[PDB]
A paper describes a structure:
Fatty acid-binding proteins (FABPs) are involved in the uptake, metabolism and intracellular trafficking of fatty acids. Based on epidemiological studies and animal knockout models, the isoforms FABP4 and FABP5 were identified as potential diabetes and atherosclerosis targets. The aim of this study was to develop a dual FABP4/5 inhibitor and, to this end, high-throughput and fragment screens were conducted with X-ray crystallography as a follow-up method on those ligands that showed appreciable affinity and favorable physicochemical properties. Structure-based drug design (SBDD) based on initial hits from high-throughput and fragment screens yielded 216 ligand-bound structures of human FABP3, FABP4 and FABP5 isoforms, many of which were at resolutions of better than 1.2 Å.
Residue numbers in the entry: -2 to 131
C-alpha cells in the first residue's frame, strides 16, 4: 500500500468556482471555454507500481495521463496545449506543474473529508473544483 492510494478511485465533479476565469488566464478561447465549462468530468485515478494514471472522461473530451512522481513528461491538455508536466506528492498533496510558451500553471489535488479538492492556479487566478466518489 501507499499514501497515494487516498486518491485512487472514481470521482465525479460536484462543484466548480472560477473555472472560466482560470481558463481565460490560461489562454483558452471562447468556444472551448464554453463547451469545457459545461463538462462534468469523471476522474479515474489508479496506481500500478510506480506509475500513476489519471483519466478524465466527459462529453467534451476524454484524456489520460500516466506518469511517475518527479519525472517530467510531455502532455497534450484538453484545450490542446503542448506542455511539459511534472507531478510530485508533497505533504500529501499531488502537485502538477505545466510549463509551455514561457508560462506556468499549477494544479493541486488534496483529500478533504470525503472530497477530492482540485485547485488550479494561473498567475493570480484560482479555480476550485470539488469531486466526490462516484
Ligand atoms: O476538470 C478538472 O478538474 C481539471 C483540472 C485540472 C486539469 C484538467 C482538468 C480536466 O479534467 C479537464 C478535462 C479533461 C477531460 C475532459 C474534460 C475536462 S474539463 C478540464 C479542462 C477542459 S479545457 C481545460 C483547460 C485547462 C484546465 C482544465 C481544462
Amino acid at each position: 500500500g501507499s499514501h497515494m492510494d487516498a486518491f485512487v478511485g472514481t470521482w465525479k465533479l460536484v462543484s466548480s468556482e472560477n473555472f472560466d476565469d482560470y481558463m481565460k488566464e490560461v489562454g483558452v478561447g471562447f468556444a472551448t471555454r464554453k463547451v469545457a465549462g459545461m463538462a462534468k468530468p469523471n476522474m479515474i485515478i489508479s496506481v500500478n507500481g510506480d506509475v500513476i494514471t489519471i483519466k478524465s472522461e466527459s462529453t467534451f473530451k476524454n484524456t489520460e495521463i500516466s506518469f511517475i512522481l518527479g519525472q517530467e513528461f510531455d502532455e497534450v491538455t484538453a484545450d490542446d496545449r503542448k506542455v511539459k508536466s511534472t507531478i510530485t506528492l508533497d505533504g500529501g498533496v499531488l502537485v502538477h506543474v505545466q510549463k509551455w510558451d514561457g508560462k506556468s500553471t499549477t494544479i493541486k489535488r488534496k483529500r478533504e473529508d470525503d472530497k477530492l479538492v482540485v485547485e488550479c492556479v494561473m498567475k493570480g487566478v484560482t479555480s476550485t473544483r470539488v469531486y466526490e466518489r462516484a
